Design a binder for this molecule. Structure first.
Ligand SMILES: Cc1cc2nc3c(=O)[nH]c(=O)nc-3n(C[C@H](O)[C@H](O)[C@H](O)COP(=O)(O)OP(=O)(O)OC[C@H]3O[C@@H](n4cnc5c(N)ncnc54)[C@H](O)[C@@H]3O)c2cc1C
Ligand SMILES: Cc1cc2nc3c(=O)[nH]c(=O)nc-3n(C[C@H](O)[C@H](O)[C@H](O)COP(=O)(O)OP(=O)(O)OC[C@H]3O[C@@H](n4cnc5c(N)ncnc54)[C@H](O)[C@@H]3O)c2cc1C
Ligand SMILES: CN1C(=O)c2cc(C(N)=O)nc3c(N)c(Cl)c(N)c1c23
Ligand SMILES: CN1C(=O)c2cc(C(N)=O)nc3c(N)c(Cl)c(N)c1c23
Ligand SMILES: [Zn+2]
Ligand SMILES: [Zn+2]
Lengths: 230, 230
């Protein structure tokens, strides 16, 4: 770096294991000389609901509200709510977007789901047609750093939870790839709450160490075969 | 039937295709004599964020906030916010829970993701142990009624989106089966915006017609093989 990174962070507690993973990511990428910005969604009280308040001024069809159409037209006419445009500018500038979050129901916490729903709008993140490899965020990298309650053994193809790759599909493929991102391999820190004080220190250190050489990684082939196949 | 149904509905616009599918479900299950309740999350301005405002009493650990630990303890103590217990009463009474929503990033809209995050807490919907076939909502049925932008061709194993069942996994397996529901086959209404007025009417009618015999259906085998094959 010479590189800009955005960390989109979704945890309530600065003292949490997620808070420690976000802080070491800021510490290490800052040390390397990278430009670093963090969107701390709970501290921002980030609005998750997709509503007509996301368009300023007058609606494109006030009779029948269509969120997708309204947001697409508002984006083209620079008429989105400023909380959304502020995130868009951070994404537009970033070379890498890291998402740091605890797994909630095999997915992102709703506050982070709402960041994907509201910030990655038509006209900004993709066009129709104009998605997956034609997506408007091509050239950028993305990485999921997730923590779980379930153990690694529970997250195997024949464990109770299935392979972790099975829950990544909607986030890596349906969201990040659809927008044109190249996807770096996920960082999955399994079951930190029932690990010891060491162990948790270890996982934090492994993430710091990985970040040392993050710019030398190639992306995954974000395919059904990678997620589901043999 | 002789049965109670809760419809958890996530669409901003009553005149929408989702709105029509929600209304026809209420119409047909009412006509059958069933007891029917709808949680219209956007009309309720349903809170999606998992925060410390969801607990009203003394926290177990006021120094380091852990949402899971504090909501489990608050469920037991009856100190959860009333919007969450209002939803829990609806679920507790229901024999079948239908989720009606447009697909957002291969998942539920954030407002609905927040209902899952905040309503299905430990102690209410599962315990550890007490999950998957031992989950606390055993005996209840759930059904996802989803609408998409992508066509059915795009949601096939060789199409750009992958098979439709791939995105269902975090919802049907990671959430509904984990809480002990038996899951009925999803209702997927593909690409209503693309379709003719006649084809849209046909999709609404197919859902109404299916609901006529819903109580005779068996659940799917909510397994990795059913979602992913081989
Ligand atoms: C609504 C909801 C839904 C969920 N759904 C799922 C799901 O579908 N699947 C699933 O597997 N799990 C699920 N979980 C559990 C959740 O993913 C895990 O609880 C979460 O990932 C744990 O991460 P955390 O940062 O909150 O842990 P924390 O409790 O913050 O940390 C774990 C321990 O690490 C300590 N710590 C903090 N910083 C450091 C450091 N630098 N070094 C060492 N230790 C440190 C803390 O003091 C603590 O003792 C769910 C939880 C909730 C609330
Ligand atoms: C944030 C966001 C993320 C999304 N992510 C994805 C995704 O990952 N994958 C994906 O495939 N799609 C995605 N979509 C597209 C979304 O799933 C579809 O736009 C939504 O499913 C369409 O449903 P609707 O009810 O909003 O449609 P509507 O626009 O209401 O329905 C189309 C038409 O049906 C008409 N209609 C209403 N009622 C009836 C009736 N009774 N009979 C006949 N016609 C009727 C309406 O008047 C309208 O003209 C996304 C959209 C947004 C906004
Ligand atoms: C605390 N906690 C866990 O440890 C854990 C493990 C798993 C799993 N392996 O699927 N899932 C959950 C889940 N859905 C919720 Cl809401 C939760 N609060 C919790 C877990
Ligand atoms: C409007 N719209 C679509 O028709 C459509 C289809 C597909 C898809 N994967 O097939 N995905 C999306 C998507 N992620 C967004 Cl945000 C959206 N606004 C939209 C679609
Ligand atoms: Zn992909
Ligand atoms: Zn299952």
């Amino acid at each position: 770096a010479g590189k800009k990174v955005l960390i989109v962070y979704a945890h309530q507690e600065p003292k949490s294991f997620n808070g420690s993973l976000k802080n070491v990511a800021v510490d290490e990428l800052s040390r390397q000389g990278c430009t670093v910005t963090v969107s701390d969604l709970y501290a921002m009280n980030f609005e998750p609901r997709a509503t007509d308040k996301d368009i300023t001024g007058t609606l494109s069809n006030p009779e029948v509200f269509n969120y997708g159409v309204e947001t697409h037209e508002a984006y083209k006419q620079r008429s989105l709510a400023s909380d959304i445009t502020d995130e868009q500018k951070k994404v537009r500038e970033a070379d890498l977007v890291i998402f740091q979050f605890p797994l909630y129901w095999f997915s992102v916490p709703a506050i982070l789901k709402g960041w994907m729903d509201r910030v990655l709008c038509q006209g900004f993140a993709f066009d129709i047609p104009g998605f997956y490899d034609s997506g408007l965020l091509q050239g950028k990298l993305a990485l999921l750093s997730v923590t779980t309650g379930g153990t690694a053994e529970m997250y195997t193809k024949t464990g109770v939870n299935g392979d972790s790759r099975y829950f990544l599909w909607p986030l890596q493929h349906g969201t990040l790839h659809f927008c044109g991102f190249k996807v770096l391999a996920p960082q999955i820190s399994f079951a930190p709450e029932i690990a010891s004080e060491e162990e948790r220190k270890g996982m934090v250190a492994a993430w710091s160490q990985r970040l040392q050489t993050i710019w030398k990684e190639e992306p995954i082939p974000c395919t059904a075969h990678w997620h589901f196949g043999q």
